[PDB]
Amino acid sequence: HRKVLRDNIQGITKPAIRRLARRGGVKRISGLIYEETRGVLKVFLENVIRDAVTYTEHAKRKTVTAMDVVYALKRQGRTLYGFGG
Template sequence: ITKPGIRRLARRGGVKRIRGLIYEESRGVLKIFLENVIRDAVTYTEHTRRKTVTAMERDGKLRRGAYWSSNGLSAIN
């Protein structure tokens, strides 16, 4: 994810100023989060003996992980 992309996400979350070191930290946190979501989606897809991961698996993982709100993804606490 690019520096401007991280900045846009931070602005959406209400952040006004961003320290330079936060970009690498944000990339690391995002990578771990996505690895977990993708791993669980692939595991579920394999369990159902399919080869294509659908939005259903992705959304299911996000809901089970308490990252889902009525407006979409919620803040990770």
């Protein structure tokens, strides 16, 4: 990846988070929601991935395939349609 990947969570701009909450139905948003979103988000991701990569290591590959994620999400209880079938 060359340039060291750092502080990319703050790459979930405030406008974007606000957008997600609009599609969510939220009308007004406290100023402290944003960082709170990154916190929840980051954990969600670390998990789906952590399991995904486990699947990748089990298959002995250097690539994380769409299925690896689809399986990760399934066991996480967040089943997703549109990539693994």
